[PDB]
Design a protein around this ligand. Structure first.
Ligand SMILES: *C/C=C(C)/C=C/C=C(C)/C=C/C1=C(C)CCCC1(C)C
Ligand SMILES: *C/C=C(C)/C=C/C=C(C)/C=C/C1=C(C)CCCC1(C)C
Ligand SMILES: *C/C=C(C)/C=C/C=C(C)/C=C/C1=C(C)CCCC1(C)C
Ligand SMILES: CCCCCCCC/C=C/CCCCCCCC(=O)O
Ligand SMILES: CCCCCCCC/C=C/CCCCCCCC(=O)O
Ligand SMILES: CCCCCCCC/C=C/CCCCCCCC(=O)O
Ligand SMILES: CCCCCCCC/C=C\CCCCCCCC(=O)O
Ligand SMILES: CCCCCCCC/C=C\CCCCCCCC(=O)O
Ligand SMILES: CCCCCCCC/C=C\CCCCCCCC(=O)O
Ligand SMILES: CCCCCCCC/C=C\CCCCCCCC(=O)O
Ligand SMILES: CCCCCCCC/C=C\CCCCCCCC(=O)O
Ligand SMILES: CCCCCCCC/C=C\CCCCCCCC(=O)O
Ligand SMILES: CCCCCCCC/C=C\CCCCCCCC(=O)O
Ligand SMILES: CCCCCCCC/C=C\CCCCCCCC(=O)O
Ligand SMILES: CCCCCCCC/C=C\CCCCCCCC(=O)O
Ligand SMILES: [Cl-]
Ligand SMILES: [Cl-]
Ligand SMILES: [Cl-]
Ligand SMILES: [Cl-]
Ligand SMILES: [Cl-]
Ligand SMILES: [Cl-]
Lengths: 219, 219, 219
């Protein structure tokens, strides 16, 4: 089961890479080329992640369960680019962009510690990582969105759908984590891999398509 | 003894995080918000460090002594932000900012190698790391300070006190290192932890308060 | 044999560091200081690499062969600076600079995986890493070079020689890799070290001299 969803991730991310790489080469202006290139590297990093996991790399058992710690290494490089998708479309100020990238880097490193620590202590770092995620939720839902609507007042719903889809998908990750083997262990290890794979595909390929649709709406 | 000073670091850095996080939310202009946000992440990274050390993480014995190698991982992210405190207040040119961040990154990585190497060879990397620190001392005491005084000629002592306090505190770190177990081993491992904890608190919380006082003097 | 070429690398890179560090201190304008400082850190990172390897650090046997994995750690910081040499001389746009640094970071991480993986699977990551290198070759030979010639139309051969020398040297690295023990293992481990050392010296010290010669031609 797990090996199948890892290979589904490889091909989906790799095929996602080809499309965005083709769009970056044939982009009619620089604004389209940057967004195409951003989503291209996002899918390229994710393809390398799933190829590594599919080949049995980047996994050392913690607490008797298979733990793909390599996710946090590639998420660390791919998730800031997904935030750059948002800040580039909204023409967000660099200070807010830096707070988003810093909170995201903090969320991931502390989420890594929760994954590879003993079962009782793990929940402290989970709470820490969730608190850092709550900062991102606030930053994206309030100051980022209002700034973006104020610059593009004829396309407020475009940014609203963008932030909603982005935050619904990101919110699903700590839900899978807390219920998977490294949390309360309510379901299997194979279902956790499938969840993250479905989520990764949506938040990178699916969201990448949405970002292009948003840029066209911005005209 | 050591577990106590680790927990002193957790609470002090965490309480330091709350204050700077509150000041960033209620900042009256963007210049105050950036400085508050900078010191907020500085204390947030340091809180995570001490929480990790307090919980027995990020430490593998080298040469028979307890070695918290996790310090170098978090210093690598927190110390460049402390340099950004200086360059932001002085409106330092980006090339000088890059040399400061590069010399600082070099000092820390080579200082890491000295910490986790055999006893004789360790002193080569210590000398290397100290040489990289001497570059920072020169960069901050001469070109940074003169550039800052030239832009703020009515507040030259503000930058002078700022650089002096910053460099006195940073200079104390290699002194503790060379006399601690990983150096000539003149005192215990508990006193080393207390030294770094006192120093970390001063150079992050204490220096963070000083940076705000300096910005007010700049008006 | 190998210990000799490691020490040749230490002294050559260190002596290379002194020269570029002296040129950065006595630079007559800021454009010369930036280029001198860039090549200074390039040789400083490389000196630390060879000092680490000469001292028996950063090497864990993979597949029965001595594998200096520390190369990829220092290449990761030194090779983007060598690309910054090119983009700074050409006044390259930041988006193209970002694609070059991203493709380079991707080439190195996947090349690292090929080095530390089982013998059959290694060639997949080698092909991946070579594909990322081919992107760099295209980026440097077409959009970077044409943009640079268009801004400096009286010095087109300067950039042409620069890109040619840079790409000839970088191309020699995957050739050494595929024929060394971690590839088809046609020659020894000592010859691999000598190859990389000769190549590193050329692409950092030798190329550093070339970059200064190019800047003078640009006047
Ligand atoms: C393409 C990859 C994406 C969108 C990754 C998203 C990851 C997160 C939103 C991380 C979530 C976590 C928490 C909020 C707390 C601790 C557990 C994590 C790391 C799953
Ligand atoms: C908040 C953390 C701070 C201010 C860290 C400061 C660390 C240093 C100034 C490092 C000093 C070192 C040397 C100069 C040489 C080798 C030993 C070190 C790493 C302690
Ligand atoms: C100063 C260091 C330099 C110029 C390093 C250059 C390294 C490369 C061009 C890397 C080449 C690789 C491939 C293209 C594929 C896999 C094997 C590598 C990592 C040697
Ligand atoms: C697993 C998912 C695989 C994804 C790759 C296959 C999908 C490629 C589909 C073709 C898209 C053609 C139309 C694209 C034009 C750009 C749209 C736009 O500008 O918003
Ligand atoms: C271990 C140290 C704990 C630190 C947190 C407790 C200290 C908080 C004190 C309150 C400060 C209230 C006054 C601050 C106004 C800003 C000063 C300024 O603008 O320069
Ligand atoms: C192993 C290689 C050692 C390298 C260090 C020794 C070489 C130093 C030689 C002296 C260079 C003196 C002339 C330099 C003037 C700058 C040239 C220029 O501006 O293009
Ligand atoms: C810009 C960043 C580029 C990221 C590329 C992503 C592709 C590589 C993914 C992770 C590589 C991890 C390699 C693991 C080494 C083997 C150790 C193990 O088996 O546990
Ligand atoms: C407990 C984990 C906290 C994670 C850190 C994130 C907290 C956010 C910190 C300060 C937010 C400041 C936002 C930057 C200002 C944006 C508004 C503007 O652009 O002017
Ligand atoms: C266990 C899961 C942990 C993750 C928590 C993150 C979920 C946060 C959910 C939504 C909080 C509400 C955000 C406010 C939306 C903006 C308000 C508005 O614009 O009207
Ligand atoms: C932007 C950077 C954010 C930094 C957050 C700092 C908080 C985390 C600190 C270090 C985590 C180290 C985790 C160590 C894993 C266990 C290995 C061990 O026990 O030796
Ligand atoms: C031996 C370790 C050395 C560590 C590297 C640091 C050495 C500094 C190198 C060159 C300094 C150049 C400073 C940048 C110019 C600032 C002046 C300006 O802004 O114009
Ligand atoms: C063993 C400890 C190693 C750390 C060494 C760092 C200490 C350096 C001490 C001060 C050097 C003098 C710096 C010159 C100050 C500026 C001169 C001036 O402005 O008048
Ligand atoms: C800005 C980046 C600065 C880079 C400095 C380069 C010098 C240090 C080089 C690599 C250090 C690797 C240390 C290896 C630790 C010992 C582990 C082992 O023996 O295998
Ligand atoms: C298979 C590994 C691929 C590695 C990633 C590199 C591929 C390059 C991706 C898109 C190239 C876009 C180049 C940026 C535009 C430069 C032109 C400009 O400045 O306007
Ligand atoms: C096994 C080695 C793998 C490395 C492959 C990289 C070698 C690529 C060689 C050259 C490809 C041709 C590049 C085109 C040059 C520009 C064309 C032109 O300007 O006329
Ligand atoms: Cl990823
Ligand atoms: Cl609009
Ligand atoms: Cl820290
Ligand atoms: Cl002033
Ligand atoms: Cl290097
Ligand atoms: Cl010209």
């Amino acid at each position: 089961m797990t090996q199948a969803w890892l290979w589904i991730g490889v091909i989906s991310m790799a095929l996602g890479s080809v499309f965005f790489g083709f769009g970056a080469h044939n982009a009619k202006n620089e604004r389209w080329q940057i967004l195409y290139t951003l989503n291209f590297f996002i899918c390229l990093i994710a393809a390398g992640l799933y190829l590594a996991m599919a080949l049995g790399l980047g996994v050392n058992v913690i607490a008797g369960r298979p733990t793909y710690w390599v996710r946090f290494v590639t998420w660390f490089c791919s998730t800031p680019l997904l935030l750059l998708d948002l800040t580039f479309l909204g023409r967000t100020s660099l200070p807010l962009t830096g707070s988003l990238l810093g909170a995201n880097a903090y969320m991931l490193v502390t989420g890594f510690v929760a994954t590879v620590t003993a079962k009782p202590m793990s929940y402290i770092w989970y709470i820490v990582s969730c608190a850092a995620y709550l900062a991102i939720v606030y930053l994206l839902a309030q100051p980022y969105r209002i700034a973006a609507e104020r610059k593009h007042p004829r396309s407020k719903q475009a940014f609203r759908t963008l932030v909603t889809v982005h935050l619904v998908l990101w919110t699903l990750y700590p839900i899978v984590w807390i219920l998977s083997p490294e949390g309360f262990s309510t379901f299997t290890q194979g279902s956790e891999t499938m969840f993250y794979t479905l989520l990764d595909i949506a938040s990178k390929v699916g969201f990448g398509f949405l970002s292009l649709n948003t840029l066209h709406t911005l005209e």
